[PDB]
Amino acid sequence: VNPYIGRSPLVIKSYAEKLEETIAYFEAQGDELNAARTRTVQGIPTFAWISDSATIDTIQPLIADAVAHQEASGEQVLVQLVIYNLPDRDCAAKASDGEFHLDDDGANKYRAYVDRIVAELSTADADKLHFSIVLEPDSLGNMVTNMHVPKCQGAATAYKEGIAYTIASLQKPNIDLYIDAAHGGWLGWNDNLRPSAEIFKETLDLARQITPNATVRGLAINVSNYNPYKTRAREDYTEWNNAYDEWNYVKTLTPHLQAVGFPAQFIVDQGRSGREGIRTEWGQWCNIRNAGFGIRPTTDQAIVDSANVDAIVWVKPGGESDGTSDVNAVRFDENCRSPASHVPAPEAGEWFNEFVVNLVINANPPLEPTY
Ligand SMILES: [Mg+2]
């Protein structure tokens, strides 16, 4: 069943707290409407990312807070998590912050990292909650389009085996899993559709060699990207790609999932999708200037308009930088100085207040104020 129906995805307190800076900024500008819209954003659920082992320490406090909230509110709390730590992570990038490396026991270390997450998701408090978990952004798409890259060649089996173990390890009645499936501009090209469906099924099949009746709910798309759910002005760079918005990505990928027997249910990130015409190339991803908050999290079919979409969600938390634009930074990524990037920007994950100011102003539909 669609786990989002009737459920209240969890507001991430640590994220809502960061927005106090944005509220203070608008108040200091004499801008009560945008201050109030930012207050609305504080109440919008986002995903909590587990992108390293240290972050596992945040999970039990998050769960305890979630249970307290469930008791107080009478809601059916749905905790949204991202697992993002495969060994030799981000194999096609020039650099990665992933902490595990295949040549330093990374496969076993990844299993133990998953085991630590499982432990946290196995407490009596965890049992009271429901979870929606996105598995490993920037992973399997590389086996479709980046197999000319030495690091991807060396990591392909490990990505499939890693994700298989994660799936097999999180088979509980209160957990729904969505495997990351990139975005239309990556895997939506005609040549990529069938191989993508095949690798998702292959990975699920591997999971079932570990835990016999293992399942997933489906796929997560547009994670940390900006693609509109429904475009109002198709971009020139989408020429010859039928997945020119994410609703069309769902429509075009679905038949291939069905053909291979992989579940064709999707959650779609729209956290930074409010404004179009902000990029000159589809491949631009880092702190794209003038991005706006998009469609708010919802299961409403009047908006979603697809039996294959479980929900629109906000996976990447807007305001957390994609990377630094400082040319002299140790982790400088040239993508973060693209012609479309917002500069200066702080290190990946650090608060980028100027960017959130713009996410509020450029939100579509406009944010309703909470006065
Ligand atoms: Mg490192």
CA–CA distance, 85 with 54 (Å, rounded to integer): 11
CA–CA distance, 145 with 131 (Å, rounded to integer): 31
Numbers of helices and strands, H then E, in the chain: 13, 8
Helix, strand or coil for residue 66? helix
Cα(first)–Cα(last) distance of the chain, in Å?
36
DSSP label at residue 239: T
Q: Is 316 annotated as a binding residue?
A: yes
CA–CA distance, 51 with 46 (Å, rounded to integer): 15
The CA distances from residue 177 to 99, 225, 263, in Å, are: 23, 20, 11
DSSP label at residue 296: P
Q: Using the mean position of ligand 1's atoms as its centre, give its distance from the Cα of residue 210 in Å.
A: 30
CA–CA distance, 10 with 59 (Å, rounded to integer): 13
Active site residue 322: yes
- Which one of the listed residues 65, 88, 322, 333 is annotated catalytic? 322
φ, ψ (nearest 5 deg) of residue 82: -115, 130
CA–CA distance, 238 with 346 (Å, rounded to integer): 30
DSSP label at residue 276: -
Q: Using the mean position of ligand 1's atoms as its centre, give its distance from the Cα of residue 100 in Å.
A: 8
φ, ψ (nearest 5 deg) of residue 96: -140, 145
Token couple for 361: 């102003």
Q: Which technique?
A: X-ray
Nearest to 312 by CA among 265, 267, 278, 350: 267
Q: Is 183 annotated as a binding residue?
A: yes
Helix, strand or coil for residue 110? helix
Contact indicator for 343, 337 with CB cutoff of 8 Å: yes
* SS (HEC) of 133-147: EEECCCCCHHHHHCC
Nearest to 238 by CA among 251, 223, 253, 248: 248
Round the CA-based radius of gyration of the chain to a whole number and report it. 20
Q: What is the DSSP string of 186-198?
A: HH-SHHHHHHHHH
Q: Using the mean position of ligand 1's atoms as its centre, give its distance from the Cα of residue 52 in Å.
A: 10
How do the residues of the chain divide into helix, strand and coil, expressed in percent and rounded to 5? 40, 10, 50
273: which residues sit within 8 A by CB, 6+ positions away? Answer: 222, 225, 226, 227, 228, 229, 246, 291, 292, 294, 295
Nearest to 93 by CA among 349, 322, 360, 315: 322
Active site residue 90: yes
Token couple for 249: 């990505």
Contact indicator for 176, 132 with CB cutoff of 8 Å: yes
CA–CA distance, 139 with 110 (Å, rounded to integer): 14
Query: Which H/E stretch holds residue 218?
Result: strand 218-221
Contact indicator for 4, 132 with CB cutoff of 8 Å: yes
CA–CA distance, 230 with 232 (Å, rounded to integer): 7
Q: Using the mean position of ligand 1's atoms as its centre, give its distance from the Cα of residue 332 in Å.
A: 14
Domains in the chain (CATH in brackets) are 1-371 (3.20.20.40)
Helices (H), the chain: 13-18, 20-28, 32-42, 59-73, 106-120, 124-127, 141-145, 150-169, 184-187, 190-208, 246-260, 301-304, 353-361
CA–CA distance, 233 with 228 (Å, rounded to integer): 10
- Which one of the listed residues 65, 88, 90, 180 is annotated catalytic? 90
Active site residue 138: yes
Helix, strand or coil for residue 159? helix
Residue whose pair of structure tokens reads 């995903």 in the numeric block: 47
Nearest to 47 by CA among 227, 188, 178: 178
Q: Is 281 annotated as a binding residue?
A: no
Cβ atoms < 10 Å from Cβ of 72: 8
Q: Is 240 annotated as a binding residue?
A: no
**What angle in degrees, to the nearest 10, is found between the helix axes of 150-169 and 190-208?**
50
Nearest to 66 by CA among 57, 78, 52: 78
Nearest to 336 by CA among 280, 288, 293, 271: 288
CA–CA distance, 83 with 10 (Å, rounded to integer): 17
- What is the dihedral sign for C-alpha 63, 66, 72, 78? negative
Question: What are the beta bridge partners of residue 298?
Answer: 312
Contact indicator for 325, 86 with CB cutoff of 8 Å: no
Nearest to 58 by CA among 21, 23, 13: 13
Parallel, antiparallel, or unpaired for β 130-135 and 48-50? unpaired
Nearest to 218 by CA among 190, 174, 254, 271: 254
- Which one of the listed residues 138, 176, 245, 269 is annotated catalytic? 138
Question: What are the beta bridge partners of residue 312?
Answer: 268, 298
- What is the dihedral sign for C-alpha 362, 363, 365, 370? negative
